[PDB]
Protein backbone atom coordinates (compact mmCIF):
# COMPACT_ATOMS: atom_id res chain seq x y z
CA UNK A 1 0.00 0.00 0.00
CA UNK A 2 2.93 2.30 0.67
CA UNK A 3 4.35 1.57 -2.78
CA UNK A 4 1.22 1.76 -4.93
CA UNK A 5 -1.43 3.57 -2.92
CA UNK A 6 -4.08 0.88 -3.14
CA UNK A 7 -5.56 -1.76 -0.88
CA UNK A 8 -3.52 -4.92 -0.17
CA UNK A 9 -6.27 -7.18 -1.50
CA UNK A 10 -5.71 -7.56 -5.22
CA UNK A 11 -7.71 -8.77 -8.21
CA UNK A 12 -5.74 -11.06 -10.48
CA UNK A 13 -5.74 -11.26 -14.24
CA UNK A 14 -8.06 -14.08 -15.27
CA UNK A 15 -8.63 -14.96 -18.91
CA UNK A 16 -12.36 -15.84 -18.81
CA UNK A 17 -13.33 -13.66 -15.88
CA UNK A 18 -11.34 -10.41 -15.86
CA UNK A 19 -11.35 -10.05 -19.64
CA UNK A 20 -14.26 -7.65 -19.22
CA UNK A 21 -14.34 -3.92 -18.67
CA UNK A 22 -17.24 -4.02 -16.19
CA UNK A 23 -15.53 -6.06 -13.49
CA UNK A 24 -12.09 -4.54 -13.97
CA UNK A 25 -13.46 -0.98 -13.90
CA UNK A 26 -15.64 -1.65 -10.85
CA UNK A 27 -12.69 -3.16 -8.98
CA UNK A 28 -10.54 -0.18 -9.95
CA UNK A 29 -13.21 2.33 -8.89
CA UNK A 30 -13.47 0.59 -5.53
CA UNK A 31 -9.82 1.48 -4.89
CA UNK A 32 -8.09 -1.82 -5.55
CA UNK A 33 -5.48 -3.40 -7.76
CA UNK A 34 -7.67 -4.35 -10.71
CA UNK A 35 -6.08 -6.17 -13.62
CA UNK A 36 -7.48 -6.46 -17.13
CA UNK A 37 -6.70 -9.85 -18.60
CA UNK A 38 -4.56 -10.19 -21.68
CA UNK A 39 -5.51 -13.60 -22.95
CA UNK A 40 -8.72 -12.45 -24.62
CA UNK A 41 -7.70 -9.28 -26.45
CA UNK A 42 -6.62 -11.21 -29.52
CA UNK A 43 -7.00 -8.51 -32.21
CA UNK A 44 -6.38 -4.80 -32.58
CA UNK A 45 -10.06 -3.94 -32.94
CA UNK A 46 -11.02 -5.76 -29.74
CA UNK A 47 -8.06 -4.17 -27.94
CA UNK A 48 -8.97 -0.63 -28.99
CA UNK A 49 -12.63 -1.24 -28.16
CA UNK A 50 -11.79 -2.39 -24.65
CA UNK A 51 -9.51 0.60 -24.07
CA UNK A 52 -12.43 2.78 -25.18
CA UNK A 53 -14.81 0.96 -22.81
CA UNK A 54 -12.46 1.39 -19.85
CA UNK A 55 -12.03 5.10 -20.58
CA UNK A 56 -15.81 5.33 -20.63
CA UNK A 57 -16.34 3.41 -17.41
CA UNK A 58 -13.75 4.86 -15.03
CA UNK A 59 -14.33 8.05 -13.08
CA UNK A 60 -11.65 10.79 -13.29
CA UNK A 61 -8.51 9.88 -11.37
CA UNK A 62 -8.71 6.11 -11.17
CA UNK A 63 -6.27 3.84 -12.99
CA UNK A 64 -6.13 0.16 -13.90
CA UNK A 65 -3.47 -2.40 -14.75
CA UNK A 66 -2.80 -4.96 -17.45
CA UNK A 67 -1.81 -8.63 -17.61
CA UNK A 68 0.41 -9.97 -20.37
CA UNK A 69 1.01 -13.64 -21.08
CA UNK A 70 4.67 -14.12 -21.92
CA UNK A 71 5.06 -17.60 -23.43
CA UNK A 72 2.06 -17.15 -25.72
CA UNK A 73 4.08 -15.99 -28.75
CA UNK A 74 1.51 -14.37 -31.07
CA UNK A 75 -0.30 -12.74 -28.18
CA UNK A 76 2.97 -11.45 -26.71
CA UNK A 77 4.09 -9.98 -30.03
CA UNK A 78 0.72 -8.29 -30.40
CA UNK A 79 0.51 -6.92 -26.86
CA UNK A 80 4.08 -5.96 -25.94
CA UNK A 81 6.83 -7.23 -28.22
CA UNK A 82 6.23 -6.79 -31.94
CA UNK A 83 3.52 -4.22 -32.05
CA UNK A 84 3.48 -2.14 -28.91
CA UNK A 85 -0.20 -1.80 -28.20
CA UNK A 86 0.06 -1.29 -24.44
CA UNK A 87 2.81 1.28 -25.01
CA UNK A 88 0.79 3.09 -27.69
CA UNK A 89 -2.28 3.15 -25.44
CA UNK A 90 -0.19 4.58 -22.61
CA UNK A 91 1.37 7.21 -24.86
CA UNK A 92 -2.11 8.12 -26.09
CA UNK A 93 -3.11 8.56 -22.48
CA UNK A 94 -4.87 5.50 -21.17
CA UNK A 95 -4.77 4.90 -17.43
CA UNK A 96 -2.47 1.86 -17.46
CA UNK A 97 0.04 2.12 -14.62
CA UNK A 98 1.10 -1.50 -14.39
CA UNK A 99 2.05 -4.52 -16.48
CA UNK A 100 2.01 -8.01 -14.97
CA UNK A 101 4.28 -10.56 -16.62
CA UNK A 102 2.71 -14.00 -16.26
CA UNK A 103 3.70 -17.56 -17.20
CA UNK A 104 7.47 -17.33 -17.35
CA UNK A 105 10.37 -15.06 -16.40
CA UNK A 106 12.66 -13.50 -19.04
CA UNK A 107 16.43 -13.59 -18.78
CA UNK A 108 18.59 -10.84 -17.30
CA UNK A 109 19.36 -8.44 -20.13
CA UNK A 110 15.97 -8.46 -21.85
CA UNK A 111 14.23 -8.24 -18.48
CA UNK A 112 16.22 -5.13 -17.53
CA UNK A 113 15.54 -3.74 -21.01
CA UNK A 114 11.83 -4.36 -20.45
CA UNK A 115 11.82 -2.58 -17.08
CA UNK A 116 13.66 0.37 -18.63
CA UNK A 117 11.42 0.42 -21.72
CA UNK A 118 8.27 0.59 -19.64
CA UNK A 119 9.76 3.06 -17.17
CA UNK A 120 10.57 5.28 -20.14
CA UNK A 121 6.92 5.80 -21.07
CA UNK A 122 5.92 5.75 -17.41
CA UNK A 123 4.31 2.42 -16.57
CA UNK A 124 6.23 2.33 -13.25
CA UNK A 125 4.86 -1.05 -12.05
CA UNK A 126 6.39 -3.96 -13.94
CA UNK A 127 5.61 -6.97 -11.81
CA UNK A 128 6.51 -10.63 -12.20
CA UNK A 129 4.80 -13.82 -11.15
CA UNK A 130 7.08 -16.87 -10.76
CA UNK A 131 6.15 -20.53 -10.56
CA UNK A 132 8.93 -22.45 -8.82
CA UNK A 133 11.84 -21.76 -6.49
CA UNK A 134 14.38 -21.22 -9.27
CA UNK A 135 11.83 -18.94 -10.95
CA UNK A 136 11.81 -16.98 -7.68
CA UNK A 137 15.62 -16.79 -7.37
CA UNK A 138 15.85 -15.51 -10.94
CA UNK A 139 13.73 -12.51 -9.98
CA UNK A 140 15.91 -12.04 -6.89
CA UNK A 141 18.81 -11.80 -9.36
CA UNK A 142 16.78 -9.25 -11.37
CA UNK A 143 16.13 -7.09 -8.33
CA UNK A 144 19.77 -7.34 -7.31
CA UNK A 145 21.06 -6.28 -10.72
d(CA 122, CA 8): 22
CA proximity to 80, closest of 108, 46, 47: 47
67 with 38: CB under 8 angstroms?
yes
Q: How far is the CB of 32 from another protein (least distance, A)?
A: 5
> How many other CB atoms sit within 10 Å of the CB of residue 13?
23
Q: How far is the CB of 101 from another protein (least distance, A)?
A: 14
- By beta-carbon proximity to another protein, the closer residue of 22 and 83 is 22
Q: Cα–Cα–Cα angle for 102, 104, 106, nearest 5°? A: 110
41 with 67: CB under 8 angstroms?
no
Q: How far is the CB of 45 from another protein (least distance, A)?
A: 17
Q: How far is the CB of 113 from another protein (least distance, A)?
A: 18
Q: Cα–Cα–Cα angle for 125, 128, 132, nearest 5°? A: 165
- By beta-carbon proximity to another protein, the closer residue of 11 and 86 is 11
Q: How far is the CB of 110 from another protein (least distance, A)?
A: 23
- By beta-carbon proximity to another protein, the closer residue of 16 and 145 is 16
What stretch of H or E contains 48? helix 44-57
**Interacting residues toward another protein by CB under 8 A:** 1-2, 4-12, 14-17, 20, 22-23, 26-27, 29-33, 40, 60-61, 63, 90, 92-95, 97, 122, 124
- By beta-carbon proximity to another protein, the closer residue of 12 and 142 is 12
- By beta-carbon proximity to another protein, the closer residue of 108 and 119 is 119
Amino acid sequence: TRLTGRSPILLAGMTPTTVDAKIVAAAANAGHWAELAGGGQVTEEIFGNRIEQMAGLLEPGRTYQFNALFLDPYLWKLQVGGKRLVQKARQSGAAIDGVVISAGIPDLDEAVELIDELGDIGISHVVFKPGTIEQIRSVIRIATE
